[PDB]
């Protein structure tokens, strides 16, 4: 017989939920360190569709010999930079599990919704560690489906924030965003959302830079989600500056990160991974800004599944899909 | 609303009863040749399991532009070398087609079926142009799955074969082996005898070290290197002729035999299936030595084929719709 465990978006949702997926980013994080995660070359096709717009699909695997038994799995998301434009997400797909033994794919989840908790999950791992001790506000720049996933992992795990400070370029999209306890201020400008607090998210699809030191109270912190919005000074005046894993961040140049380090040294103070086995100390602000300049590893989103699929197997949620249906 | 085609195998048997796997592997070849596809380079995740056994996932993408326009999609096909020895099949895993505008995986089949269906689909369209003619024996070393569906289709493809000379390491699984019903098997007890019993060989083994030489051919002798690791370098060398899938895909997985002796330096390749589809380059029949194909295994003939499946599951009101977001 040949049976998938089939989980989709609510499922998911309903099982993130019921487990510690903090716990679990911090857990691959420490596998991760100690060279116990396999992250091998992304299969890519590219294409363009009849819209004249770039898609591609993108098959990520995986390995993790974690804190539990090895886990084996797939992430596969799929984007075309024209389905904004038609009232779809830009990204779509699947994950999968695969059996240590046997190698069979037994457990098939929608992964969209895992790939923007996994974000938000290592998000509040780096302000656990690396953030002020008690902030109770949070700014956002975009609010889309990134910002809900931020907001309720907020609710969950730094209770004492009650005010959201958000821009968004579309403005509409500022003015409908509600968040999870959590007062929203709509702000007219990206500066202003900044100012307003001591921690900021950026969640843009931007390719042109526009934050400068000047922006940051002394004692703040941001997780650059978005990858470009961070002028190259804030890099180089950086009270300190945590990475997920450098050689990702080296490899890819057209990112502001990725581009210093092609030009020279840059003060990269460690990866969240050190200082969750004690090999880096953690750096909290006081003077300046600390910056988390995470690229996102897909074997974090392989943990979460597996971590998710168990809580489904013990709660009797999902379908199971007959492969061979005699 | 994120809907999904889901084709169970039984499903997938059905559809594919009324397609010609030979014509569509041919189609795409030739479009391959007219670089009218895009093959990415193979996801790769080796490891090992409790019991020591070499297991491996592979996530091999790929884009067809043709028969019924731009076609994109994955065969995600995951092996344990232990599968066999707790009564499973070696390989399984599942095929996507995504929606060529949006980019979202819109069919989701069983693939290990219809991937021994395209090995086997291949292996006659490469008999029909380079094999000999009327040859009315063929002798298979490994008898699973593989051997199963090459039998289905050489009693559809090439009805003059009557005799199939069959090894297996597990002697159990050769007695066991009927092929089709117009098929007639002999039982050897050494993949040499095996080889000596027809001029046309497939190799359907798990073997990682080459173990079958020049000396063992007769003349105007075939082999479907389709377990790519059972001939040695000089049946390579000595080759009347060599034809490959894709020459770029084969350089650049050294894991296997062709692989290493590319690396190593020239080696006498004769052309493409493709190639030879197309007119790029002349058909070689076997007359005084062993023709050679050695087909690493490309990506856009499962997307090919599973484009047609789909159309036709499509056509009968088959498989299951799954909602991937639900309540």
């Known amino acids: 017989s040949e049976e998938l465990l089939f989980l989709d978006r609510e499922t998911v949702r309903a099982c993130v939920a019921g487990v510690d997926p903090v716990e679990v980013v911090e857990s691959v994080l420490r596998s991760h360190a100690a060279g116990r995660t396999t992250l091998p070359a992304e299969g890519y096709l590219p294409w363009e569709n009849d819209q004249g717009a770039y898609c591609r699909s993108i098959a990520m695997l995986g390995a993790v010999d974690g804190e539990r038994g090895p886990t084996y799995g797939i992430k596969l998301i799929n984007a075309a930079v024209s389905n904004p ?161 450098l050689e990702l961040i080296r490899e890819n140049p057209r990112r502001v990160l990725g581009a210093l380090l092609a030009d020279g040294d840059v003060p990269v103070t460690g990866s969240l991974g050190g200082v969750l086995t004690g090999a880096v100390a953690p750096v909290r602000p006081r003077d300046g800004v600390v910056v988390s300049n995470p690229f996102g590893m897909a074997v974090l989103d392989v943990g979460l599944l597996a971590e998710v699929a168990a809580h489904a197997r013990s709660a009797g949620l999902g379908t199971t899909l007959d492969l061979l249906g005699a």
């Open 85 to 245: 434009s038609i009232g779809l997400d830009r990204a779509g797909g699947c994950g999968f599990l695969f059996d240590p033994r046997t190698a069979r794919p037994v457990v098939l989840a929608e992964a969209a919704y895992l790939s923007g908790l996994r974000t938000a999950a290592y998000t509040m791992a780096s302000l656990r560690h690396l953030g002020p001790v008690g902030f109770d506000a949070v700014s956002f720049i975009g609010t889309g489906a990134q910002a809900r996933v931020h907001a309720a992992l907020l609710a969950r795990y730094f209770p004492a924030v009650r005010d959201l400070h958000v821009f968004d370029t579309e403005r509409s999209r500022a003015e409908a965003f509600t968040g999870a306890g959590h007062t929203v201020h709509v702000h007219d400008t990206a500066e202003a959302a900044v100012r307003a607090s001591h921690v900021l998210v950026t969640l843009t699809t931007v390719d042109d830079g526009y934050i400068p030191h000047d922006w940051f109270r002394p004692g703040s912190f941001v997780a650059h989600v978005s990858l470009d919005d961070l002028l190259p000074e804030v890099f180089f005046k950086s009270e300190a500056l945590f990475v997920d894993d």
